[PDB]
Amino acid sequence: STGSATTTPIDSLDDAYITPVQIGTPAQTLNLDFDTGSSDLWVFSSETTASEVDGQTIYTPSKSTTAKLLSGATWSISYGDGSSSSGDVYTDTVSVGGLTVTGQAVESAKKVSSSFTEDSTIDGLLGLAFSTLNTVSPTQQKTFFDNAKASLDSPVFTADLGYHAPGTYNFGFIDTTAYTGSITYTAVSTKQGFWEWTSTGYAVGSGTFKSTSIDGIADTGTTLLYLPATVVSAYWAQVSGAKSSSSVGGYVFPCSATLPSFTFGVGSARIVIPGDYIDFGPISTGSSSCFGGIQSSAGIGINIFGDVALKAAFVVFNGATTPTLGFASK
Ligand SMILES: CC[C@H](C)CNC(=O)C[C@H](O)[C@H](CC(C)C)NC(=O)[C@H](CCCCNC(=S)NC)NC(=O)[C@H](Cc1ccccc1)NS(=O)(=O)N(C)C
């Protein structure tokens, strides 16, 4: 079996993408944030504290005939940006672009943090990192991909995210019409439970490729590109008006500038992010100052190949016994 779903940015700055998911019987469609950086599928529902509910679409376990409460299981998670959620768990049928998994754990939120209540276009998260990061207790619940693996035509899923446009998530197949060149595969360490890999170096604009190991994670749930502070500094050094702002939280630049591209190595291959994808957007509507999409990972503690990187390539999360990650130019 296979599945294909279109995914869309929740705003005009590509802060996140949501993909529709059908949960329960008859199907309840929710729009979730497909996150390769977590392993929890949870959604807002009939159980979340009302005043914690904005205009999100909720899951009502009670209206689904295949739902089953998972006796005694609870969950609690906190994310990298401080948000958090917790609740209980049900198992139900979950479909993604025609790809159905029965008995998938759907974690029902009882409480959500303020950033989630305020983001009206995200109904929950669908985690895609290793099941070892799952927060359900006492027994960890497998991700949608671990559960679909038996059925998949090939154990893989690809991310094809768009720059200010829709994209696609596909499961169990590789669409050769979607990228150019061939796919370069790189080893993944699962020690931390993440889609963790090592980049071979970088290049700023039309300058030299520097061979330096960049250990990082590929995470569709992270907006920007977090690199070591000395690589970020070499990028911004090429942009005349750019500077580091303590008030805004990072490098800012005149919106007016044409920024250089940024290339990161994948083995022998190079993936070129267009200077424009690095222009995240102005600080505030009308400002002459814009937010840089390449930020320092000094304060996070790990490098993150988030959305600004991920959208410049065709990405293959190959979930075979020995997982690997493939990158293609598109
Ligand atoms: C078991 C716990 C596991 C390890 C949790 N994994 C994780 O926590 C990684 C996972 O991908 C989350 C998903 C996110 C939707 C809440 N990413 C994040 O938490 C990041 C943080 C990236 C690193 C930032 N950390 C720091 S200290 N920066 C100074 N958020 C993001 O990148 C959000 C994503 C987002 C956007 C819009 C709506 C919802 C969520 N964009 S952002 O807020 O940082 N951007 C607006 C500035």
Phi, psi of 297, deg, nearest 5? -100, 5
* Residue 6 β-bridge partners: 168
- Residue 294 in contact with residue 227, Cβ under 8 Å? yes
Q: Is 35 a catalytic residue?
A: yes
How long is the chain?
330
Q: Separation of 229 CA from ligand 1 center, angstroms?
A: 19
Experimental technique behind these coordinates: X-ray
Q: Where are the domains of the chain?
A: 5-174, 175-330
Handedness of CA 237, 203, 231, 219 (dihedral sign): positive
Where b means 16+ CB within 10 Å and e means fewer, 236-267 reads beebeebebeeeeebbbbeeeeebbbbbbbbe
Q: Is 268 a catalytic residue?
A: no
CA atoms within 13 A on the CB side of 113: 11
- Within 6 Å (CB) of ligand 1, which residues are found? 15-16, 33, 35, 37-38, 77, 79-81, 83, 119, 125, 133, 135, 219, 221-223, 299-300, 304
CATH of the structural domain 175-330, one choice from 1.20.140.10, 1.25.40.10, 2.40.70.10, 3.40.640.10: 2.40.70.10
d(CA 22, CA 41): 13
3-state secondary structure the chain: CCEEEEEEECCCCCCCEEEEEEECCCCEEEEEEEECCCCCCEECECCCCHHHCCCCCCECHHHCCCCEEEEEEEEEEECCCCCEEEEEEEEEEEEECCEEEEEEEEEEEEEECHHHHCCCCCCEEEECCCHHHCCCECCCCCCHHHHHCCCCCCCEEEEECCCCCCEEEEECCCCCCCCCCCCEEEECECCCCCCEEEEEEEEECCCCCEEEEEEEEECCCCCCEEECHHHHHHHHCCCCCCEEECCCCEEEEECCCCCCCEEEEECCEEEEECHHHHEEEECCCCCCEEEECEEECCCCCCEEECHHHHCCEEEEEECCCCCEEEEEEC
Taking the domain 5-174, which CATH number applies? 2.40.70.10
CA distances (Å), 219 to each of 38, 44, 226, 290, in order?
9, 22, 11, 23
Q: Provide CB contacts within 8 A for 321, sequence distance 6+.
A: none
Q: Provide CB contacts within 8 A for 48, sequence distance 6+.
A: 58, 87, 108, 109, 110, 111, 112
* Residue 281 β-bridge partners: 291
Handedness of CA 325, 297, 38, 159 (dihedral sign): negative
Q: Separation of 79 CA from ligand 1 center, angstroms?
A: 6
Is-same-fold flag (5-174; 175-330)? yes
For residues 199, 4, 275, 33, the Cα torsion angle rounded to the nearest 10 degrees is: -80
d(CA 63, CA 14): 33
Q: What angle do CA 175, 177, 180 make, to 5 degrees?
A: 110
* Residue 19 β-bridge partners: 32
- Residue 58 in contact with residue 44, Cβ under 8 Å? yes
Closest among 217, 221, 190 to 323, alpha carbons compared: 190
Closest among 155, 214, 211, 205 to 186, alpha carbons compared: 214
- Residue 115 in contact with residue 81, Cβ under 8 Å? yes
In terms of phi and psi (left: phi > 0; alpha: psi -120 to 50; beta: otherwise), the region of 37 is: alpha
Closest among 89, 84, 81 to 111, alpha carbons compared: 84
Closest among 187, 198, 178, 171 to 326, alpha carbons compared: 187
Return the amino acid letter for 131: S
d(CA 73, CA 140): 9
Atom of ligand 1 nearest to the CA of 36: 11
The residue nearest atom 22 of ligand 1, judged by CA position, is 222
CA distances (Å), 293 to each of 103, 209, 227, 229, in order?
39, 20, 11, 14
Q: What angle do CA 122, 303, 312 make, to 5 degrees?
A: 65
- Long-range contacts of 82-89, Cβ-Cβ distance < 8 Å, separation of 24 or more: 82/113, 82/115, 83/113, 83/114, 83/115, 83/116, 84/113, 85/42, 85/109, 85/111, 85/112, 85/113, 85/116, 86/110, 86/111, 87/42, 87/45, 87/47, 87/48, 87/111, 88/47, 89/136, 89/141
d(CA 156, CA 320): 7
d(CA 175, CA 43): 29
Phi, psi of 63, deg, nearest 5? -100, 5
Closest among 165, 99, 154 to 126, alpha carbons compared: 99
d(CA 153, CA 232): 40
Q: What angle do CA 29, 35, 40 make, to 5 degrees?
A: 75
- Residue 157 in contact with residue 169, Cβ under 8 Å? yes
d(CA 143, CA 133): 10
Q: Separation of 34 CA from ligand 1 center, angstroms?
A: 12
For strand 124-127 and strand 28-35, is the pairing parallel, antiparallel, or unpaired? parallel
Phi, psi of 10, deg, nearest 5? -80, -5
